[PDB]
Symmetry: C3
Subunit: 253 residues, 3 copies
């Protein structure tokens, strides 16, 4: 059976260790994240086609104060160590969850959404439309009797590449700059990421500057172009992302 | 920012002035429709890409007694003045609303559906499936905290062309004639419209004859062909449109 | 009007004679299935494009003890007598119904699902999402005031070919053998069926061996290959089909 490294990532409190313990059972071990004493849990389970190494990522609300759990998930996410991500998403706080989701999706990392706590969503009287959600995100959405798990495993095997949906609608000025920023960036990172990194820099993401290399000192002269062409830049971006999530939610829940 | 002329159209009582006042705020003015003393409200708002001139069309149940509100919406709709239409649709009377919708869709006018009064639909215990509705119509469907509006604006920018769905299933005889009628028609009107006009003439739409030009006096000899090949013609057509709406509704609500 | 032979097939008790009596009214007659005294009801109704000969198939839970109702539906299904199938499916026992459905879909027979007893599903508090169901199955799904019937008729005309969805996710070893089995099989049966037949043989379907011809005595040496490569074979297959239905249901109901 083929090897596959999957990252497990989600918001804190959103059922991420439950999923990990059910998937790996006993075939798990605990180490520390390199250089720190933060715990790194790792595990293995078998799908029809793969033998999967599942790495439990620290629980987080955003990829971009700073935080160590945060620097860890992000650093790992940008490393390419992972062939694919299982994004555990709490159905009963769907909007706040999709924030992390969209980031993974604009990065372009092959992603399977594991939609949980669907019992609480019923009580609280929320219904998500699974497959409408899958169509807007561009990636399979699996609702979790060990059913969800089997369905989740199969999706890991069958899913290869998220659809390119251009999910956020940005001012054209903004994209022009994120792009001009993105060519000052290391060949070492894929295209979609360099775009995302370009946009993060225009948002005031300080952290991201350290991922940008050659594009640190071009933010000021990029902030040159936009002043003409526009602005409120970090404003337009946060907003665009906020409109994109608010509209999926109103369409699917 | 780019200019874009959008028509606003819907059934009376279906929340069409509310939407118009929210979109344009104060940047509106009132004139009269050319040649009459019927009020024509016009307004402007800004999307990410466009500066939109919104023209409020008289409220109507059908494009095809006669009526002046009716002659006005239709005349404007066939003029091409409008780059795009926002079709305000009352969720709580979805079937009766889609009648106007289908007409716009068989005409081929780039169309964004604004699905409102979703509060009344809840109480009355109706749920519409937004994105299944969007897939059957071939055009974005936006459910309206100023959320819906932002989602509506973004769709105006992103939507270019309705999908060609062949939505109504017609007897082949019927289409043969609507088509033979449609070549007797002015180069000045697009293909989809000339087909629609051909069909309207076979339905007994008297009004449409004045849009047909050269194809007035061919209805009798078109009604020649169908007598052989079929009939009940105005019957088959009204019915086909009625089946098409009834099946979308049963599939999405 | 064009001729079209449709088979009507479903589980017992799932409303299959009601649908048949409504579609054909009085234009029905009763005969016996060739060689037996089992009743074969046949009927005719008119669609917009076709004049349909509807043949009522014995009610059944599976295509693959043995049974005569069972041998009859299957034999007819593999004969190609039918240009298309109307699969009547009880919404209130959706999972148990889809078992028969999947078999038709892996065979590749142009299929229209007629989704009934939607009243009982409401009471029992089940909602099916029609068009999400249609998208996963690869075939139109029509929910049945003579509405459903009209919508059903139109779909018969418009539907030509199920989408190829590879619905069940099989171990690659399994498919390798079902395929090697499938070339030992008569040119007389289409590709998708010979694959299905290959898989049925590896499942312990005894009945299917008589459809396989030249591939009877290769099951033992096919069971050669898999022992190496795997196993639990009939296990993996039944399971794969069970996961596939369980995941559609969790996604659409
Ligand atoms: Mg849906």
């Amino acid at each position: 059976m083929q090897k596959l490294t999957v990252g497990l990532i989600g918001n804190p409190n959103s059922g991420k260790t439950t999923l990990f313990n059910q998937l790996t059972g006993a075939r798990q071990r605990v180490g520390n994240w390199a250089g720190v004493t933060v715990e790194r849990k790792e595990g293995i389970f078998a799908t029809t086609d793969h033998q999967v190494t599942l790495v439990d990522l620290p629980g987080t609300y955003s990829l971009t104060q700073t935080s160590l759990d945060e620097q860890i998930a992000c650093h790992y996410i940008l490393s390419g160590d992972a062939d694919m991500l299982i994004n555990v998403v709490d159905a009963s706080n769907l909007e706040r969850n999709l924030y992390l989701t969209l980031q993974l999706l604009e990065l372009g990392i092959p992603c399977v959404v594991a939609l949980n706590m669907l019992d609480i969503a019923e009580k609280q009287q929320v219904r998500i439309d699974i497959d409408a959600l899958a169509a807007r995100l561009g990636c399979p959405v699996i609702p979790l009797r060990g059913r969800g798990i089997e369905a989740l495993k199969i999706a890991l095997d069958r899913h290869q590449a998220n659809s390119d949906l251009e999910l956020v609608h940005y001012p054209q000025p903004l994209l022009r700059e994120a792009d001009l920023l993105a060519q000052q960036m290391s060949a070492q990172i894929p295209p979609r990421q360099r775009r995302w990194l370009g946009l993060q820099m225009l948002e005031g993401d300080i952290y991201s500057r350290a991922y940008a290399g050659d594009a640190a000192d071009k933010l000021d002269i990029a902030l040159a172009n936009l002043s003409d062409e526009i602005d409120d830049p970090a404003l337009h971006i946060a907003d665009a992302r906020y409109q994109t999530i608010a509209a999926i939610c109103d369409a699917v829940s």
